[PDB]
């Protein structure tokens, strides 16, 4: 017999002691090696309730990524309130590695294997595992990158869709590549992101169709963010240690859903910023100018964060804007199928 419980997890990874890359360095002293022979036991005739929105595994992962970033990033200036810290800011090696989350003795992780499980409610295909799959701690906004895919249909996740303050996570079932480049090609901060418009617009139309099912067949319209810091109004992510800000207006083009020119490549204008707002909470940091040469990163778009416009208007349509409420929601997007229980 078991019951829902929280406990201190530990992490496992394939980090290497010879690697200078900062995730590897953190995971070398903060995690144990990955289980060579992972065991998963499918529990016959067991129904179990999950709640991805109230899952302490998420909070624990959050604290790890905060500690990782705190020990790794080296901005020229750290700013907090009135406190200013100038320090050396050498260019670092930055590339997230998969981190596994594991239970200690007396506990186990239950895992929902229902293919269209939305994150809350009963799960009828439950297995037990010692460790999660490897999750890359990718810090990004608007788009979820390099994550896992929904196995069957596109899944809409929300604690409550009627509640406009609750984050919506759209889980894709097919990846769309996003190809970002700061060319060696003169504005050194000017960059761009290329997306296959045919692939993307097909997926985005699929997303709108799934949103329709959850919102009483109302018309689904996208709009750009109404306000916020640049990390919010733009697709924000890091590539090779550099902080990228990409304009996603073209990525949510209502004309290309439901006619001429939407098949070509979508090019998003981007900027690399030296001065950023810290996602850990309150704080500003300034980094050195971008590294020389071509800066390039290809990522998989595997999810979208959305916010729905609140308030009451005679509604033919619901309006959604890219961006979610919280960095922890990124961890939720991967941890949704897991729950810790205590063995009795």
């Amino acid at each position, epitope marked *: 017999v078991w019951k829902d419980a929280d406990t201190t997890l530990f992490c496992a990874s394939d980090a290497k002691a010879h690697e200078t890359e900062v995730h590897n360095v953190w995971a070398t002293h903060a995690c144990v090696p990955t289980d060579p022979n992972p065991q998963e036991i499918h529990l016959e005739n067991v129904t179990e309730n999950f709640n991805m929105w109230k899952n302490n595994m998420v909070e624990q992962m959050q604290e790890d990524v905060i500690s990782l970033w705190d020990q790794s990033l080296q901005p020229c200036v750290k700013l907090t*309130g009135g406190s200013v810290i100038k320090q050396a800011c050498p260019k670092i090696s930055f590339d997230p590695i998969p981190i596994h989350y594991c239970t200690p003795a007396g506990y186990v992780i239950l895992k929902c294997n229902d293919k269209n499980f939305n994150g809350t409610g009963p799960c009828k295909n439950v297995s037990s595992v010692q460790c999660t799959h490897g999750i890359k701690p990718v810090v990004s*906004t608007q788009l979820l990158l390099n994550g896992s895919l929904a196995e069957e249909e596109i899944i809409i996740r929300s604690e*409550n869709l*009627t*509640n*406009n*303050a609750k984050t919506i996570i759209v889980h894709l079932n097919k990846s769309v590549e996003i190809n970002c480049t700061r060319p060696s090609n003169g504005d050194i901060r000017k960059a761009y992101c290329e997306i296959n418009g045919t692939k993307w617009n097909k997926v985005l139309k699929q997303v709108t169709e799934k949103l329709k099912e959850h919102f009483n067949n109302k018309t689904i319209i996208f709009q750009p*963010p*109404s*306000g*916020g*810091d640049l*990390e*919010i109004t733009m697709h924000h992510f890091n590539c090779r240690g550099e902080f990228f800000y990409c304009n996603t207006t073209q990525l949510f083009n209502n004309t290309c859903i439901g006619m001429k020119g939407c098949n070509g490549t979508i090019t998003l204008p981007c900027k690399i910023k030296q001065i950023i*707002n810290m996602w850990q*909470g*309150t704080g500003q940091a300034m980094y050195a100018p971008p590294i020389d040469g071509k800066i390039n990163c290809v990522s998989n778009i595997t999810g979208i964060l959305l*916010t729905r*416009d*609140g*308030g*009451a*208007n005679n*509604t033919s349509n619901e*309006t959604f804007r890219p*961006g979610g*409420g*919280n960095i922890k929601d990124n961890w939720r997007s991967e941890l949704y199928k897991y729950k810790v229980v205590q063995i009795e």
Partner: antibody
Amino acid sequence: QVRLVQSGNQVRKPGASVRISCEASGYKFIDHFIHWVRQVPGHGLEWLGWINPRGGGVNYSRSFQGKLSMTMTRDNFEETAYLDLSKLNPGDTAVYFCARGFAGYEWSFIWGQGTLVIVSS
Amino acid sequence: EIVLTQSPGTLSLSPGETATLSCRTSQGILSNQLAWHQQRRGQPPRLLIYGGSNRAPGIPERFTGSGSGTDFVLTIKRLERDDFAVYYCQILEFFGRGTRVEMNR
């Protein structure tokens, strides 16, 4: 105790702007949305929108789109939220409240004391 | 939109009596999604009940929130002078039009 203290009553001509502040205290500012609500004298409460201090993201009520030009901002260091109303019309004469949900209940509003804005020629 | 209907619009009761205020919703809601507020004239609103049935700190025990599904109730026992006020229910971003509790004599 959670407390929201707003700036003082204002008088504006049509076409002008007003910026209302909402100073929070008694809690960790960045962990709670700030909402704004208006109440025309003699009428009921109408939600305007919220701001998320973590990033400054906002949600503006569809009911006021095209009818009220508003901008919500915040200063996390000063733990203050701001409501900026531009291009005011006489119909914008109202009391404006900021609010914060009770802990664990984002829509169970705890209220600021309100700011009266008069718009008149 | 969740349509909230408060009833009655006005109550006239003697001090000492019990006020029963209703908030009815067009669709079933969750209890946590509802709040009651009190507003005395010329004053800001004050949170009374959060999450449908939880009395806010400092709120007197004579104020009690109950209800479920589509019908929520605020009951005020032993009405005192300061209780004669307007009461609003809130569900998510939506507010009822209010019930005014007035003093009978």
